Amino acid sequence: NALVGRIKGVVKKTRRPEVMGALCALPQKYREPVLVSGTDGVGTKLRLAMDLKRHDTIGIDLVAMCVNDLVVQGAEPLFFLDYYATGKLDVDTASAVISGIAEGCLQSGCSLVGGETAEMPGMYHGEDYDVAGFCVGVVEKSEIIDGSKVSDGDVLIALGSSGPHSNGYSLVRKILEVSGCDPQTTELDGKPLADHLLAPTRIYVKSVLELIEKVDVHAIAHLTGGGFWENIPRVLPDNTQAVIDESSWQWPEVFNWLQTAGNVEHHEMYRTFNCGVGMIIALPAPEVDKALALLNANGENAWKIGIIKASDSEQRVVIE
Amino acid sequence: TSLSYKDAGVDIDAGNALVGRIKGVVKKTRRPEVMGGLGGFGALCALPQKYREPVLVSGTDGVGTKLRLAMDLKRHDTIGIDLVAMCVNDLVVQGAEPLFFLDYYATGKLDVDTASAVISGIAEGCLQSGCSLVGGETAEMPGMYHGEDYDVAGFCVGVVEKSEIIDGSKVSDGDVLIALGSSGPHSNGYSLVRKILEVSGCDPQTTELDGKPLADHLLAPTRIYVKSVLELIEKVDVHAIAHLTGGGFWENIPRVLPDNTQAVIDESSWQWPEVFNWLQTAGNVEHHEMYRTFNCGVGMIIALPAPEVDKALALLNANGENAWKIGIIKASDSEQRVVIE
Numbered sequence: 001n002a003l004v005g006r007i008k009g010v011v012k013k014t015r016r017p018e019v020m021g022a023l024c025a026l027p028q029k030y031r032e033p034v035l036v037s038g039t040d041g042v043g044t045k046l047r048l049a050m051d052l053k054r055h056d057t058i059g060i061d062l063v064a065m066c067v068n069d070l071v072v073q074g075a076e077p078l079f080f081l082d083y084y085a086t087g088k089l090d091v092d093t094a095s096a097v098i099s100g101i102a103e104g105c106l107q108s109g110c111s112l113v114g115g116e117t118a119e120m121p122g123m124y125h126g127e128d129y130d131v132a133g134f135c136v137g138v139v140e141k142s143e144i145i146d147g148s149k150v151s152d153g154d155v156l157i158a159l160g161s162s163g164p165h166s167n168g169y170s171l172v173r174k175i176l177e178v179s180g181c182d183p184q185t186t187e188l189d190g191k192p193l194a195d196h197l198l199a200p201t202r203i204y205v206k207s208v209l210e211l212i213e214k215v216d217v218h219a220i221a222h223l224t225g226g227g228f229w230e231n232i233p234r235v236l237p238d239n240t241q242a243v244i245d246e247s248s249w250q251w252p253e254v255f256n257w258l259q260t261a262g263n264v265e266h267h268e269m270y271r272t273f274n275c276g277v278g279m280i281i282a283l284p285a286p287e288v289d290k291a292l293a294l295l296n297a298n299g300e301n302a303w304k305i306g307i308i309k310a311s312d313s314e315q316r317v318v319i320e
Numbered sequence: 321t322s323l324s325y326k327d328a329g330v331d332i333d334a335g336n337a338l339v340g341r342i343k344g345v346v347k348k349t350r351r352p353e354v355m356g357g358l359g360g361f362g363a364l365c366a367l368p369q370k371y372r373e374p375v376l377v378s379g380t381d382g383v384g385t386k387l388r389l390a391m392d393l394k395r396h397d398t399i400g401i402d403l404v405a406m407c408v409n410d411l412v413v414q415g416a417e418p419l420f421f422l423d424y425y426a427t428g429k430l431d432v433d434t435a436s437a438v439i440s441g442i443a444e445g446c447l448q449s450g451c452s453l454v455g456g457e458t459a460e461m462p463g464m465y466h467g468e469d470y471d472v473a474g475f476c477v478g479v480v481e482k483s484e485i486i487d488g489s490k491v492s493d494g495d496v497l498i499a500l501g502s503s504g505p506h507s508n509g510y511s512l513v514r515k516i517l518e519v520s521g522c523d524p525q526t527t528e529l530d531g532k533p534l535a536d537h538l539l540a541p542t543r544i545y546v547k548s549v550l551e552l553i554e555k556v557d558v559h560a561i562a563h564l565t566g567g568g569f570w571e572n573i574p575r576v577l578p579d580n581t582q583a584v585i586d587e588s589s590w591q592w593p594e595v596f597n598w599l600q601t602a603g604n605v606e607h608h609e610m611y612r613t614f615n616c617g618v619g620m621i622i623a624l625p626a627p628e629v630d631k632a633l634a635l636l637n638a639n640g641e642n643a644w645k646i647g648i649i650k651a652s653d654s655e656q657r658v659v660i661e
Contacts (some may be wrong), residue, residue, distance in 0.1 A: 020375065020485075021377055021378070021379050021410055021411065021413065021414055021416075022377070022378050022379070023375055023376070023377060023414070023485065024375065024376045024378070025373070025374070025375050025376070025482065026367075026374060026375075026376070032366070033366075033367055034355065034364055034365065034366050034367075035363075035364070035365045035366070035367065035376075035419075035420075035477065036357075036362040036363065036364060037362060037363045037365070037420065037422060037454065037455060037477065038361070038362045038363065038422075038455060039422045039423070039424050039455060039456060039457045039475060040424075040457055041424065041426065041457060041459040043330065043459065043461075044330065044461065046461070046464075047461070047463055047464070069361045069362050070361075070362050072358065072361040072362065073357065073358055073361060073362055073364070075362060078376075079376075079378060081378060081379075081380045081475060082380070083380045083381075083382060083424065083473040083475075085382065085426075085471050085473065113378060114378060114379060114380060115380065116380050116381065116382065118382050118384050120384065120387075120388070120471065122388060122469075123388075123465065123466075123469045123471065124464065125464075125466065128464045130426050130459070130461065130464060130471060132380075132424035132426075132457070132473045132475075134378075134380060134422060134424075134475040136376065136378065136477060137362065141366065144355075144364070145358065146357075146358050147358045147359070168325070170325060170328045170329045170330055171323060171324070171325050171327070171328065171329065173328070174323055174327050174328050175323055178323070219358065222361060225330075225332045226332055230332070234358070234359025234360065234361070235358060235359055262322075262323035263321060263322045263323060264322060264323050264324070265322050265324075268322070268323075268324050268325070271325070272324075272325050
């Protein structure tokens, strides 16, 4: 009860006109609407936020991972739900998480329409909590980005990340342990290391939806678990190879610190971390100049990162 | 020494291994509206052609207290049915047809065997509900979950025609209440169940109730009423539907009745299933608390006009439901909203 009064405003303020067991009509502009759905958790980044006593942006991470996966196929995020599971309910901690979820929903354009807080005393020790996220998007059936248009000669455009986002934090915590440094004390390019590590995942919803309306996008890859090696081939047709130009961008410094402090090898960095790339967009070469101009002028860090070539190689991604 | 995700890591491939094993069981739930996605970034499902103004009905849930007892007795083939049943039975309350379902599975180290049995129960619940299991997430957080503990959360999406949303405004003085029998406690009242089991020193596996061990009665999967309720709305003017969950008769029945209306329950119209008689005796529970904690054999209550009762009962009983007239609706002259006589 002490929580529902502190979070009834976030459900009210994120409300879309379509919102009426939560009720939400479909946006009127869709003639043949197709529902796109997904669920997620924040991951090991929860443990780092707990160790740091910083829960103010965990809810942004939760929404971002959901909504970024929806917009990959061209879907407009419609509504969001979360399942807050904990041992003993720390009202201040849950309020900070829900505030972050509300911020993520507002940036995504979707409404926080439902949720639940469950208390499992014997399963969570301390003040631990686990939050599941759930989001539903709508895409026009004819406008689904199914990746079937990815062809030889397409150019790859990368969108910069705000940091590690919400993947690879199991390795982050191991690197911090073996280095023994204090993340709040260790300064890194003028900011504490903890700020680099806890930075909320960037939400690409509005910029991608603006892009699809103006240029012809063939596919989009959200770089999450498994980094480049696992996520890029998910959008590649058979007999195609993605060639990444490693010189086209510099890693944000947090990834250099992680590599050095953990002695992490080249392939492992591109598997565990996004290394500064949140998303990769495949599109035909004549569309690149328009795409880069739109993205960089509308709040993104976009650059030409590579190309797609026809190839029967079993190594679907090359980072040279 | 070069640090890798194998020094700790969540083991994404174990989650990928789980999806590889249960891929066939999940495929069997696929509706015609389901479309293959790009690379699993999101699940694609079209809207059913039936709906001219579709309104999406969504909800999340967990089994919570029943999960504790299910793993304390080390039987987890039906808790996935409970997770789906709680979602989909709530959707049909407003008239929504369940469309698709997603689950969030979290544990310390992924036991692929235990997870596959839970997912198979979720898929089974989706088959009974007519919805598809179209996605999920498996999270490996070794430091947060100790022992063999796991947590599972469900998310469901249903569709309802906008002009047909059931909000209880059609409830009238004189509406007859039909009840749908439950399969047991379903998924509510289980902190009291665990307390009664403790204070009585009862091992529910070696305690026989009517020939079956008490654990079978306590852990019976929640009955799914989707297909019976959707047919009822199709063939009968349904005014309201009460889903008896947490809070029992006293809390859930008024939640669907409009203001200045009262439900009068005829207690002689049914006998409590024996699992509730056992819990009442072993816990010395007041009957008023029984109606507060447990559904006492009544999973759902439908309000509808008196002329349509015979057709409704014939339809429901033809689907295998345990249906009977449980009470009536009358104007509450600033009185209590639920009365059990």
